[PDB]
Each structure stands twice: as structure tokens, then as C-alpha cells.
Amino acid sequence: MEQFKQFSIEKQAAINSLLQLRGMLEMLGEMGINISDDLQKVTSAINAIESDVLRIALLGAFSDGKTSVIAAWLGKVMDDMNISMDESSDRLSIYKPEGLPDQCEIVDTPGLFDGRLVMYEDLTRRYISEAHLIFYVVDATNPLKESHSDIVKWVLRDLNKLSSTIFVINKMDEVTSLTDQALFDEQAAIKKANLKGKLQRAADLTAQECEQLNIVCVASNPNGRGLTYWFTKPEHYESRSRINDLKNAATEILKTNVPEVLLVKTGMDVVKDIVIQRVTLASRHLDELNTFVEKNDEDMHRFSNDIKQSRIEVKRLAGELFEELNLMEKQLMSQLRPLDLDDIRPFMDDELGYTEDGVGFKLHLRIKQSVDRFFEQSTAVSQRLSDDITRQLSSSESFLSGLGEGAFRSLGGAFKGVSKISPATLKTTILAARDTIGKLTGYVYKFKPWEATKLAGSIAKWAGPVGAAFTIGSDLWDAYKAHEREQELKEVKASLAKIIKEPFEDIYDVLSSDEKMFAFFAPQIQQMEQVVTELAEKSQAIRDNRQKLSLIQTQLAQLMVPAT
């Protein structure tokens, strides 16, 4: 991996990253977000970028052997790439060597190496800012000339190119043996430390910036023999010069710094930071929305289950109620059929009730207490149902309240403007459904008056005067013969049966049909079902939106993987 292939590669990566940016923009557009003309702006920056070529700013005094360092690194002696560098001109200058695998620009400011005016020229500042690599070449004996403080500051502080600058301590030969691997590294580390201290102090560097510094020790032209000669021995030279340490450092900077240079140069750094911000934000609040829409969708099914179970339970109670009332009636009837006329009054008193009003009060109260008990158990069922619906609605309200009123504005068009959807629009629909349910829910008291049944005069004479001790007189018993009396018994029993049966008949007709049964003992179950059914319908508009957005975010997440 060498310098022009790395660049060409980093160029392409940056172009790709911008095509993914374009893709990310199309999706925002799709969720009704701005764009203005960011799509065409991005295409333009891709085109501008295609032109660009590798650029190195070669900085340093010429006497520190800068020219050797760059030829060395490229691979070719200066004249073979038909270019020749001028020692003094008070301007910026650019060299575009030839016969190389690809093109590259070599920028420098020869005047500096009141020629210090070029540091404040927007032009020479732009050309060095927009370089991908900066070599500041210094001396091994006494690294960094005494006069250069403000140039180091210009590069590292003013222009802010520390991440892309390699200080190249050159001519290490005249400080150490190029043979003794372990001594070189000892002097190379001491010289790296020394220069580190002069730079930090020339440019106000912090301790952290100091660690970021790129320093490399090298011997471009070792012994003094020359490049033309040393290229003839390419693998001997590399071990001695340590030039590979420089190519490698340069390769890692390119790896990192080439895209930043290209993005900034075209103004796309800013475009891209904003787009990735809106997308990151957009999925973080789609996650919120999904949580709400999922929960709400699951509650709806949960509410219809509750209603089912509710209904199943009430049906079970209605049947138990019926079973209980049917025994009561069978029991009373089997007590009646064997009774002789003396037995009658005790029976009316003790089982039915016998008053001036008439007969039936005692039975009525006992039927009533059985009906009441069901009406209460069944009213409690409907109360447990209201409490679950009401609990879940409230936890949706509470989820949506913690989102913030602007939580969905990043999701674009449907959450902005006069028809906007928001946590508060959705909360409202929920709370009016919870309100309608808090008014349905109710124990009720409805008074149902009861009249007793008067006994026929004919049958009143076998019962006796109300509330008195009564046995049947001789005068009454010997007014009939047996067949005139056992018939008198039959029509009195006929009389009590009709009385006994009546109150059950009515209520069995109610329990025999679920429509009626429900309408009398548990109407709020149907009423709550209505409310739940309506709430379901009002939930469509977000479901429509959440779907579009999810399909959309799936694509965004894809486009965003490279950017992570």
C-alpha cells in the first residue's frame, strides 16, 4: 500500500460517503423534510472532488535536506520527474512532477526558508490548508531552526494542521550509527523528545496535542553518497535510511485526513454533520413512536380479550343464578304438593309470607337477595374490566407525557403545521376515551316496587286471620264432605303454585337471553366495547405514518452503517 493508491482509494471512499449522503437526503425528502437543493449541492461536490490530486506541503529549510526527503519518498530523483525547485521567491509555489504513477502537487513557501508576510496571504494559507500531507523537514543535530517559532505556530495553531503534519528529523546519520539498530532507536527517541518540547513551546501546545504530534527520524541521503546511487541498492537503502517509517506514517495520515480535507474543501463537512444529526435524531424518536403504537395496538386486542373473558364470566354467574333459583322453586313446589289443609297456613307463613297486603313478601325478599347477589358479582366483573382498560390507557398517556411536546418534529411533515400530530394530539384521544369509560362505570340503584298478591276470599278462609295463632275450627271442617274438601284443597294449591311460580317465570325470561341478560345486569360491557371500538378507528392515522416511517428508516439505517 503506497501513497497514490491510498489517496485514490481515500478519494473514492469520500465520494461514496457522499453518495450515501445523497441517499440519506432522498429519504428525509420522503418524510417531508426540507432538502432545499442539498441533492444538487452534493452532486456538485462529488464532481469537484473527482478533479483533486494528492498535495504535499514541503516545509523546512533547504539546508536541512528537504529536497532529498521528498524525492526519496516519491521514489525518483528530482530530475527524472522533470521538475526543479527554486531556492528563493517571495511567493507560494507549486511543482507538478511528471513520469509518476499519478499526478500530485508539491506546494511550498520558499521565501521563509519580512518574507513572513506570506503567512498572512489568504492564498498561500488556502493551498496549505487544503493539502493532504505536510512535511516539516528539520535537522538531526539541532532540530528546528531558531527562527521558525512562528511558522510552526502558523501550521499547528493558526492553520490547525497538526493531525496532517509529519515532522521529519532528517540526517540521523550524523547523530548515530545507521548500523546499530538499538542505538538509533535510543538517539531517535531522545531527538523525538527534544523536538517535541520545542514545538510544544513554539505553538502553545497542550499535553494532549503533544501526544498527537507526528515525528519520524530519517536519513534521506545517508553517508552522503546520494540518491541516484542509493536507488541502485533499494533494499539496502530502506533499512538504513528508515524511509519506510516515513512512508508508513504518511500512509496513515492520508488514510484519515484525506476525506476531512476533501469534505471541508467542498463545504460538505457541514452538510453531512447536519444530515447525520437529523437521521440519528429521527430514528431515536421513531423508536419512541413505535413503542407507543405497538403498545396501543396490543392494548386494543387486550381490551377485546378482557371483554370476552368478562362476558364468559357473567354468563357463568347467570347460570349459577339460574341453577340456584331453579332449586328454590323445585324445593317450594315439593313442599307444597304433599300438604293437607291444616298444613297450609304454616306453609304460607314460613315459606311465602302472609300479611294484610297479601302473600309473597318472604319469597320475594329471598329471590331478591339472590338476584341482587348476581347483579353485584356481575357489576364487579364490569368494574374489573373498566379498571384494566383504564389502567392501560393511563400508561399510554404517561408514556406520551414523558416524550416532550416536540418529540416527533424530527419525523417530518405529518408532525408539523395545522394538521400536525403530536404526543398531545394522541394523548387527547386516549384521555377522552378514558373519560367516557370513567362515566360509564357505575354501581347503580334503580328502585323496583313490589305489590303482594291478595288471596281469594274463597282461599282466605283456610289460611286464617293474618298474624294470629290459627287452627281450623269445627264449624269450617264440617261444612264439606271429603270429596267437597279434597277438591277445595286442590284449588288452593293451584292458587299457591301460581303465586310461587310467577316471580321466577319473569326472571327466567331475562336470563334465558344474553341480549337481555347483559342489558339488565351488565350494560356497561357493551358500552365499553363501543368506546374501545371507536378508539381503534382513531388509531389509524398514526399506524399509516408509522409504517411509512419504518420502511423509510430501514433504508436510512442501511445508508448509515458505513458512516459508523
This entry's atomic model was obtained through X-ray
Q: Residue 217 in contact with residue 245, Cβ under 8 Å?
A: yes
Fold annotation for 2-267+559-563: Rossmann fold (3.40.50)
Question: Smallest Cα–Cα separation from 459: which of 489, 486, 502?
Answer: 489
Question: Which distant-in-sequence residues (6+ apart) come within 8 Å of 61 by Cβ?
Answer: 113, 137, 145
Instruction: Name the region of 317 (left: φ>0; alpha: ψ -120 to 50; beta: rest).
Output: alpha
- Angle, vertex CA 49, rays to CA 47 and CA 53, nearest 5: 130
Are 45 and 266 within 8 A, CB to CB?
yes
Name 133's bridge partners: 56
**Packing angle, helices 523-537 and 514-521, rounded to 10:** 90
Query: Which contacts qualify for 357-362: CB closer than 8 Å, 24 or more apart?
Result: 357/451, 357/452, 357/454, 358/452, 358/453, 358/454, 358/455, 359/452, 359/453, 359/454, 359/455, 359/496, 359/499, 360/452, 360/453, 360/499, 360/503, 361/450, 361/452
The C-alpha cell at 386 is: 373498566
> Can you tell me the distance from the alpha carbon of 501 to that of 193, in angstroms, rounded to the nearest whole number?
112
CA distance 302 to 310: 12
Distance, in Å, from the CA atom of 400 to the CA atom of 436, rounded to the nearest integer, reads 20
DSSP string spanning 290-309?
Answer: HHHHHHHHHHHHHHHHHHHH
The one-letter amino acid at 249: A
Distance CA 300, CA 393 (A): 10
CA gap 210, 120 in Å, rounded? 25
As a whole number of angstroms, the distance between CA 539 and CA 238 comes to 72
Q: Write out the H or E segment, with its range, that includes residue 280.
A: helix 268-336
Residue located via cell numbers 319469597: 363
Q: Which long-range contacts (CB under 8 A, 24 or more apart) does 371-375 make?
A: 371/321, 371/507, 373/321, 374/317, 374/318, 374/320, 374/321, 374/521, 375/521
The answer to whether the Cα torsion of 460, 463, 467, 471 is positive or negative is positive
Q: What 3 state SS string does 331-398 have? A: HHHHHHCCCCHHHHHHHHHHHHCECCCCECHHHHHHHHHHHHHHHHHHHHHHHHHHHHHHHHHHHHHH
Cβ-proximal residues to 52 (8 Å cutoff; 6+ apart), any chain: 11, 262, 265
CA distances from 496 to 142, 306, 504 (A): 131, 45, 14
Phi, psi of 165 (to 5 degrees): -115, 130
**Spatial distance between the Cα atoms of 347 and 339, rounded to a whole number of angstroms:** 9
Give me 225's grid cell.
553518497
Cβ atoms within 10 Å, residue 202: 17
> Longest C-alpha distance within the chain, in Å?
161
Note whether 165 and 156 are within 8 A (CB): yes
Find the length of the chain: 564
Burial (CB count within 10 angstroms: exposed 0-12, middle 13-18, buried 19+), residue 19: middle
Q: Which residues have CB under 8 Å from 155's CB, separation 6+?
A: 59, 128, 134, 136, 161, 162, 165
Joined grid coordinates for residue 318:
347467570
Which has the closest alpha carbon to 192: 217, 171, 175, 212? Answer: 217
Q: 267: phi > 0 → left, psi -120 to 50 → alpha, else beta; which?
A: left
Give the sign of the dihedral formed by CA 305, CA 307, CA 313, CA 316. negative
The C-alpha cell of 83 is what? 521538475
Phi and psi at residue 56, to the nearest 5°: -120, 130
On whether the CB atoms of residues 19 and 46 are closer than 8 A, the answer is: yes
Cα torsion 205, 209, 211, 212: sign: negative
Find out whether 249 and 226 touch, Cβ atoms under 8 Å: no
What count of other Cβ atoms lies within 10 Å of the Cβ of residue 559? 20
- Give the HSE-up count for residue 52: Cα atoms under 13 Å, Cβ half-sphere: 28
Half-sphere exposure of 168 (CA within 13 A, CB side): 37
Sequence-distant (6+) residues with CB within 8 A of 442 are 524
* Local structure of 74: helix, strand or coil: helix
CA distances from 441 to 8, 434, 437 (A): 74, 11, 6
Domain residue spans in the chain?
2-267+559-563, 269-558
Name the nearest CA neighbour of 410 among 282, 273, 560: 282
Phi then psi for residue 241, to 5 deg, are -65, -25
Where residue 372 falls (left for φ over 0; alpha for ψ -120 to 50; beta otherwise) is: alpha
Helices (H), 445-513: 457-460, 474-477, 482-511
Annotate 209-257 with three-state secondary structure: HHHHCEEEECCCCCCCCCHHHHCCCHHHHHHHHCHHHHHHHHHHHHHHH
Q: Give me the sign of the Cα torsion angle 347, 353, 357, 359.
A: negative
